[PDB]
């Protein structure tokens, strides 16, 4: 569908309108409980700030009419400007068009009725754009999805305790200024400071005092210097600490569910509490068992080469991992100069990757060779000549019946491509002109 | 069906009676601690409410000598009259019959003794009609096990604080009204309000103060504006906060066991997170990386494909899978159709339903054949074919065993159906009748 | 055995004494902090109770030289009465002998020095008895074992607050009685009661006040009506809430571990979760989706066959449990069972435990028959023919090899055993004259 | 690669009394530093030389890091080179370690007493590296427990963050002048009959214990409310602090939970045993056969988990001799494996799996093609004909000529039997048909 206005929502200019209008949706939903609770009609040095705030969201409900709804199941950017304009208009339109009115001028214009000031809470449907941000961030593999299920709750508490702080102050102002000794704040004395005549206290002292109660209540510390006094602040504190009691168990739940999918050090000790067993009873040479612990400290703390995981995708396309990365490592070898792709593919059917810390001897001198080795990383030592990367060893003695003439020792941290020497008999006897290719580069010394 | 004055327990009138004594059992067990704690004899403008409250639970005792039950080990609904009158009468008769007696007129017409009034607590045995609700909601997939052990723990933790509010008020009234200053509420002063002469404060101020000190204690906030000053109140809030320590730990434990025991995203994100952590170890581009992003919706999509299949194997309901959606989807393919009952029930087994994201590469040209696909959903594009439903591909690559002659790429999220090729060569050449029935009709 | 007077530790007279000294070890370890904290040397009225409290532990001293030691390595009853005198004199002898001295008479006969009263805390090692009781309770597998770790944490939690109440009261008594206004209890005023001259407040008011502080501190409520005043009470409350912070996280952890390894209804409702999301996309049934969970509530939540856990035990001894239970149910079955030991041992592995709910039909007349079902108990209906226990059906499907002539309906939830037709092909052909001997009396009676 | 003389090897036993010497200087002067900032404005003269000798212990440690060969994590080399260990130090921890060693109390007292030259004391808290480079060397040490290192670096973080929150909370009371002192948390404090007025001349340890008492009661979320925040700058600190340790207490509960729901192998076995015992105790099987399954499924159970973990771990070129030291003296005393070469037994030892079985269980029967081929390590088995003792072999003629195995296996004492597939053995006798001819002759002789 051509439709040369309809923004596909990966456009880079529809991302200076999703982290622009997300900053506005954080301001406009952190300020709206403060505008409801701590003011009755905004002071007129906040008139431009309340006018231009609702313009940025007003030119955002025209940019929902020209945006590409990628469909719910049949994945398709539905470019049709009568089904994006009718998907929006009955999902969230009049919770974005209602909370865009100048509810502070409607309040003051209509004779200052208090009930027309409760429609500020329709502007809390802009934290939607912060929960359509912790949903487009768990769909991002560079961090854990369950870590974002903790960071979602740690914005939720901290938005519920700012909103609770702003409703708890508001409930003090619903009694007349002469009945303020029967409120939580007009009857407060902290230190030598009396919070009498609290409506003329500085805004940030009143906000910080109301937020102090709500945070030491959310944490369930609850000192009791600030407490409910009324019968209507008791009902709010009862609702709020019942909401927190569930919300604080949910936080502990998510942190525990993160930790039960544990870390690599306790996964190392998971693989090693049993490797104290079996080798105490049926013990090996504890020099080589110390290097076994070394190779477990090398599979852990380092590369998790996923031969433990590549069984998920099928064998011919996990041999395609052995195609688009192994045509580098196998064609780079000077032993296979002049070898066609089929021999390469049948060799990389049966390849393995192992790693070697310095200290081993890999193919021992004076004894039979067991495997093919190609060098990816690190650097080796043959004792006489130093055999580095993209090179062959173990391989000058399986083409004939010879032994390994070098104590091929490992000097840097290596990345051996190890293959069974059974394979370099079957692949070598089925393909004959390939066998003579290896024969003539053997005679190319 | 032998007696006809028994009631089948799923009769749709006796499901609108059980929802009628569930709003009385919620009322009469929330009201009963307020009948005990906050009054000494119920007032005169509450007489007709206390009478007609205990009538609804009195035509529930004559209506349960008539109700058929389904046995616990015999597992058949029992309709025997002189057997239901000995199951009800062994379990729930007297705790239903005692708490019906008019214990406010029995209190008042016996010279107002206080011990005739602790028999109101027999009516808290009516909360069993609320645990019989959250225990029949348990067994409901229709209404999720999204939160049942954890909602019935949030009812029992606002029912035990409504009751503790009423016992905590009642212990204030056991000291005479001249020892009010040695009481949690007679010595209370909140703001400029003094709760003195506290028996003459209106009921909802007393009740809301007592509930404030049950909920602030249950949440373990514990401000300290209201606290126990007495020895009997000290003993009560010791018992209560021990019970709450255990109950709050149990609530936290149930929520974290619901969150630990995760299924759907705990088979999905743990795939691609580790897989991109391995492909950013050794770089694999994006085309095959997106194709393996499609592959984690080939081995995880469609109910984890062939792992949950292998449980309803004693019950012969794989006939329904094997002829009710697979063989319709098979009769939705051209030659693969198989077109004969034996062969189609033979190849109906080894299939895999496969979800591919758009933009993907499905089968390249010059590529060795490896799998066979039945398309029923999605839309595919070949590089020559605008593939909608059931015009599926991979047909002429198997007998003419050469590379697939087309490069198909998908444009909207598709739902392929996979068989292995080595199946449909072996039982291909086994069925020579269907061998001819396959290789006669090639698209002319 | 060979040594005469050595009581074996599993008698019925050293198990009435192990529970007699469990109520002297629950008394004398709950009373020992009350004797330390609340008295400066017991009253004369509490004299004989102390002496008989200590005399019941001298009897338990000498009855450890006469108890047969159950060894820890050799796993036997070491009757050697110098192998049971030793390990006692190396384990528990002295600390159960410096807790039997009369430390309230050898405190008052020494000038009443208050440092010999800290030898009362040697009597607190008699909660060995209470934790030994919770060690021979995990062995009792009749009740759960993580549940027996959350009652070994609600004894340890309400014993560490009884002790912390007595230490907290004790710390108020370490200041002189004229500096009592600088203690937590001498400066206490609850309601209109003043706790001044607190040493003459009677013992249960003082104890209940101290214990109320310790319990609302354990629960982390902390009203702060009673709080620490001194520096020594600050240090104690700091130690105690820090200790009780890891003891309360341990309780939550042990509760979670029990709930995670837990219920069989949420082991049933997640199976049916993706099964109903399965059948809402795979479309097996419209109301037999009830007959799906009519069988996920028949074989599951009840009749819990752990046959996948019988896959864990060996096939040999799984055939042996099939012998020892199945074959008395297998043999009381009609004539088409085989009437010989070889046949029933050759078929007994193949039969699967099945149940069926009433109102269900099994196999309609006029189809190929795939299985044979044999009733152990239960009531079946062939249609007009009532088949109770020992009245197994599935006879006429292979005997006179025509179609089945009945419709087996279920009249009571039964105990069928289902072998497949491959069983009554293999075992019926290798023993063929047994099958024709079965045919020799097919309802000829 | 020890070509560099004066470089200290990083595991030397004398540079390990300088990792446990500067860890007791790093524990002292990371605990003393918030006390030096918080409770003093410039140290007294009494604490002079303790200051000076505190910083010439971390000054010796600066030039003892240019002489220590670090060990790489990409080449895994101890880089013994002064030009290569210096530029690692100078770009990781040098400005956090050099200017944390300046005398920031002579730069305070001698720069005219400007505060803000005293906030540079806070970069001596970058010596808790040495305590988290300790809990990262204790956690790659399975020699020590995981209940001693896993929550124990959270019962350091929760007594380091409440020692430091106790010193900032006191410090904020000193930022108000000593006239506006009853508007602080401590100058307006009155506990008991003691008033903390004129608080700057209270002893250091009363002032420190009061602040730590607040901080620990707040960390535990008791919150008595006898000490609370009265300022607005102390309200903000308490709001930051109780929000920080609401996350940190949930992390402690999560760690203690995930250390319990990963309960070890013993209680996994007890779970196994209670469900196994109960499953045939509610149907009431014989206790003798339940004890038979006990005596068998137990060696079978531990054999199962240890054999699968020894096979799936230990990658190739090191697994081979482990398996050979497991198996070859037990399979070379074998009349079937005689005469063949050594590379064949190198291939054999990997595909071997040991097992454990009972005196009385059977492996295969009369009607049977085997699932495996077996050789003997332990056992007293029988073929029903041949009473096979130790160092024996069975399943051999069913390999080559594909005939059914006529002998039921009767094991008479607890064995150590050797699992090898028929499929893999046929695969490697396809490979070693040079040895396969000896195997055909070995079954035929
Ligand atoms: K408090
Ligand atoms: K708390
Ligand atoms: K609290
Ligand atoms: K509190």
- The CATH code of the domain that includes A191 is 1.10.287.70
Residue D154 phi, psi dihedral angles, 5° rounding: -125, -15
In angstroms, rounded to a whole number, what is the distance separating the alpha carbons of residues B246 and B251?
9
In angstroms, rounded to a whole number, what is the distance separating the alpha carbons of residues B150 and B191?
37
Contact D221 B223 (CB under 8 A): no
Contacts of B211 in chain A (CB under 8 A): 234, 238
**Residue list, annotated binding site of A:** 335-445
Q: How many CB atoms lie within 10 A of CB C431?
A: 18
Total length of chain B: 444
Do residues C248 and D222 make contact, with C-beta atoms less than 8 angstroms apart? no
In angstroms, rounded to a whole number, what is the distance separating the alpha carbons of residues C56 and B394?
89
> Can you read off the two tokens belonging to residue D389?
């003792």
> Can you read off the two tokens belonging to residue C144?
């759960």
Q: Specify if A274 maps to a domain.
A: no
Q: Specify if A155 maps to a domain.
A: yes
Is D319 exposed, middle or buried, given 0-12, 13-18 or 19+ CB atoms closer than 10 A?
A: middle
Q: Are D236 and D286 in the same domain? A: no
Q: Specify if A302 maps to a domain.
A: no
Asked whether the CA dihedral B265, B268, B269, B270 is positive or negative, the reply is: positive
Q: Are A155 and A54 in the same domain? A: no
Which residue shows structure tokens 């945006």?
A67
List of residues 6+ apart from D240 with CB closer than 8 A: none
Q: Are D118 and D189 in the same domain? A: no
Task: Return the H-helix or E-strand segment holding C379.
Answer: strand C379-382
- In angstroms, how far is CA B137 from the centroid of its own chain? 7
Do residues C188 and C209 make contact, with C-beta atoms less than 8 angstroms apart? yes
Q: Specify if B68 maps to a domain.
A: yes
The gap between the terminal CA atoms of chain B, to the nearest Å, is 64
> Can you read off the two tokens belonging to residue D238?
């308490």
> Can you read off the two tokens belonging to residue B208?
């809301």
Mutate to test the interface with B, among A79, A176, A186, A228 (most CBs of B within 10 A): A228
Is residue C182 less than 8 Å (CB to CB) from chain D? Answer: yes
List of residues 6+ apart from A198 with CB closer than 8 A: A172, A180, A183, A185, A186, A188, A206
Shortest Cα–Cα distance, D171 to chain B (Å): 26
| Resolution of the structure in the document, Å | 2.6
In angstroms, rounded to a whole number, what is the distance separating the alpha carbons of residues C368 and D430?
44
Which 110-149 residues of chain D touch chain C by CB within 8 A?
Answer: none
Choose among A220, A224, A256: nearest Cβ to C256.
Answer: A256
**Residue C158 assigned as binding residue:** no
Residue that finishes a domain, picked among B110, B126, B142? B126
Q: Are A146 and A121 in the same domain? A: no
Residue B373 phi, psi dihedral angles, 5° rounding: -125, 130
Q: Are A88 and A108 in the same domain? A: yes
- In angstroms, how far is CA C65 from the centroid of its own chain? 32
Q: Are D124 and D171 in the same domain? A: no
- In angstroms, how far is CA D253 from the centroid of its own chain? 18
Domain count, chain C: 2
Query: Among candidates A71, A129, A59, which has minimal Cα distance to A97?
Result: A59
User: Alpha carbon of A362 to those of A118, A184, A302, A405: distances in Å?
Assistant: 78, 78, 21, 12
> Can you read off the two tokens belonging to residue B79?
């309709």
**Residue D352 assigned as binding residue:** yes
In angstroms, rounded to a whole number, what is the distance separating the alpha carbons of residues D259 and B223?
33
Do residues B40 and B118 make contact, with C-beta atoms less than 8 angstroms apart? no
> Domain range for residue D167?
135-262
Do residues D377 and D417 make contact, with C-beta atoms less than 8 angstroms apart? yes
Which 354-373 residues of chain C touch chain B by CB within 8 A?
Answer: 354, 357-358, 370-371
Q: How far is the CA of D223 from the centre of ligand 4 (A)?
A: 4
Which residue shows structure tokens 């390590």?
D377
The DSSP code for C355 is -
In angstroms, rounded to a whole number, what is the distance separating the alpha carbons of residues C11 and D435?
65
CATH number for the domain harbouring residue A399: 2.60.120.10
Which 223-242 residues of chain D touch chain A by CB within 8 A?
Answer: 223-225, 228-232, 235-236, 238-239, 242
Do residues A121 and A32 make contact, with C-beta atoms less than 8 angstroms apart? yes
What DSSP letter does each residue of D296-318 carry, written as one string? HHHHHHHHHHHHHHHHHSS-TTT
The gap between the terminal CA atoms of chain D, to the nearest Å, is 58
Query: Among candidates D397, D424, D394, D425, which has minimal Cα distance to D409?
Result: D394
Subunits with 3+ C-beta pairs closer than 8 A to B: A, C, D
Strands annotated E in A153-296:
189-190, 193-194
Q: Are A45 and A141 in the same domain? A: no
In angstroms, rounded to a whole number, what is the distance separating the alpha carbons of residues B403 and B396?
10
Q: A-C interface: how many C-beta pairs under 8 angstroms?
A: 7
Q: Are A91 and A179 in the same domain? A: no
Query: Among candidates A139, A221, C245, which has minimal Cα distance to B272?
Result: A139
Shortest Cα–Cα distance, D223 to chain B (Å): 8
Q: Are B234 and B340 in the same domain? A: no
Q: Specify if C214 maps to a domain.
A: no
User: Alpha carbon of D9 to those of A84, B278, D15, D61, D70: distances in Å?
Assistant: 68, 34, 8, 15, 8
The DSSP code for C402 is S
Residue D346 phi, psi dihedral angles, 5° rounding: -60, -40
Contacts of D76 in chain A (CB under 8 A): 298, 357-358, 412-413
Residue that finishes a domain, picked among C88, C113, C129? C129
Please give all residues whose CB falls under 5 A of ion ligand 2, grouped by chain where several chains appear. A 220; B 220; C 220; D 221
Q: How far is the CA of D226 from the centre of ligand 3 (A)?
A: 13
In angstroms, rounded to a whole number, what is the distance separating the alpha carbons of residues C297 and C268?
8
Do residues D54 and D29 make contact, with C-beta atoms less than 8 angstroms apart? yes
> Can you read off the two tokens belonging to residue C223?
């009203």
Experimental method of this PDB entry: cryo-EM
Choose among D225, D257, D261: nearest Cβ to B224.
Answer: D225
Contact A220 C223 (CB under 8 A): no
Is B298 exposed, middle or buried, given 0-12, 13-18 or 19+ CB atoms closer than 10 A?
A: buried
Q: A-B interface: how many C-beta pairs under 8 angstroms?
A: 148
In angstroms, rounded to a whole number, what is the distance separating the alpha carbons of residues A427 and A352?
16
Q: Specify if A6 maps to a domain.
A: yes
Strands annotated E in B237-325:
none
In angstroms, rounded to a whole number, what is the distance separating the alpha carbons of residues B228 and B240?
12
Task: Return the H-helix or E-strand segment holding B153.
Answer: helix B148-170
Shortest Cα–Cα distance, A210 to chain B (Å): 15
Crossing angle (nearest 10°) for helices A160-170 and A232-259: 170
Contact C235 D209 (CB under 8 A): yes
In DSSP terms, A361 is beta-bridged to A409
In angstroms, rounded to a whole number, what is the distance separating the alpha carbons of residues B139 and B148?
9
Residue that finishes a domain, picked among A92, A125, A158? A125
Residue B420 phi, psi dihedral angles, 5° rounding: -75, 150
Helices (H), D332-363: 342-351
What DSSP letter does each residue of A307-367 carry, written as one string? GGTTTSS-HHHHTTHHHHTHHHHHHT-STTTT--HHHHHHHHHTEEE--B-TT-BSS-TTS
In angstroms, rounded to a whole number, what is the distance separating the alpha carbons of residues D49 and B43?
81
Task: Return the H-helix or E-strand segment holding A435.
Answer: helix A432-442
Residue D303 phi, psi dihedral angles, 5° rounding: -60, -45
In angstroms, rounded to a whole number, what is the distance separating the alpha carbons of residues C153 and C130?
12
SS3 state at C351? coil
Q: Specify if B414 maps to a domain.
A: yes
Query: Among candidates D309, D376, C233, which has minimal Cα distance to A279?
Result: D309
What DSSP letter does each residue of A11-65 carry, written as one string? -TTSSTTTSSHHHHHHHHHHSHHHHHHS-SS--TTSHHHHHTHHHHTTTSSSTTT
Task: Return the H-helix or E-strand segment holding D439.
Answer: helix D433-444
Query: Among candidates D204, D186, D185, D127, which has minimal Cα distance to D160?
Result: D127
Q: Specify if B26 maps to a domain.
A: yes
Is residue B280 less than 8 Å (CB to CB) from chain D? Answer: no
Which residue shows structure tokens 């190319």?
A444
Do residues D77 and A358 make contact, with C-beta atoms less than 8 angstroms apart? yes
């Amino acid at each position: 569908n051509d439709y040369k206005y309809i923004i596909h929502p990966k456009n880079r200019w529809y991302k200076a309108w999703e982290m622009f209008i997300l900053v506005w949706a954080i301001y406009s939903s952190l300020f709206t409980p403060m505008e409801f609770g701590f003011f009755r009609g905004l002071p007129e040095r906040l008139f431009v700030l309340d006018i231009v705030g609702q313009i940025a969201f007003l030119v955002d409900i025209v940019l929902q009419f020209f945006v590409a709804y990628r469909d719910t199941q049949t994945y398709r950017t539905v470019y049709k400007p009568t089904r994006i304009a009718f998907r929006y208009l009955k999902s969230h339109f009049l919770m974005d068009f209602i909370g865009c009115f100048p509810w502070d001028l409607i309040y003051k214009a209509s004779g200052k009725h208090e009930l027309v000031r409760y429609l500020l809470w329709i502007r809390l449907f802009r934290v939607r754009k912060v929960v359509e941000f912790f949903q487009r961030l768990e769909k991002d593999t560079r961090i854990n999805y369950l870590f974002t299920r903790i960071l979602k709750l740690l914005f939720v508490e901290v938005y519920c305790t700012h909103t609770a702080a702003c409703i708890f102050y508001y409930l003090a102002t619903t009694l007349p200024p002469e009945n303020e000794g029967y409120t939580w704040i007009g009857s407060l004395k902290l230190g030598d400071y009396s919070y009498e005549n609290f409506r003329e206290i500085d805004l940030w002292k009143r906000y910080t005092t109301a937020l102090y109660f709500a945070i030491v209540t959310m944490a369930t510390v609850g000192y009791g210097d600030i407490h409910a006094v009324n019968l209507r602040e008791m009902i709010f504190v009862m609702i709020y600490v019942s909401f927190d009691m569930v919300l604080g168990a949910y936080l502990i739940g998510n942190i525990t569910a993160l930790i039960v999918k544990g870390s690599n050090t306790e996964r190392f000790r998971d693989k090693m509490n049993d490797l104290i067993s079996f080798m105490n009873r049926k013990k090996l040479g504890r020099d080589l068992r110390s290097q076994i612990t070394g190779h477990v400290r090398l599979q852990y703390d380092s590369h998790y080469t996923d031969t433990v995981m590549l069984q998920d995708i099928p064998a011919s396309i996990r041999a395609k991992i052995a195609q688009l990365l192994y045509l580098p490592y196998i064609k780079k070898v000077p032993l296979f100069k002049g070898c066609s792709t089929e021999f390469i593919n049948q060799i990389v059917i049966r390849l393995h990757e192992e790693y070697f810390l310095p200290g081993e001897v890999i193919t021992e001198q004076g004894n039979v060779v067991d495997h093919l080795y190609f060098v990816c990383e690190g650097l080796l030592e043959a004792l006489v000549t130093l055999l580095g990367p993209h090179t062959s060893f173990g391989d000058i003695s399986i083409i004939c019946n010879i032994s390994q003439p070098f104590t091929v020792r490992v000097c840097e941290l290596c990345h051996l491509l190890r293959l069974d020497k059974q394979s370099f008999s079957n692949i070598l006897e089925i393909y004959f002109h390939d066998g003579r290719t290896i024969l003539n580069n053997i005679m190319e010394e």
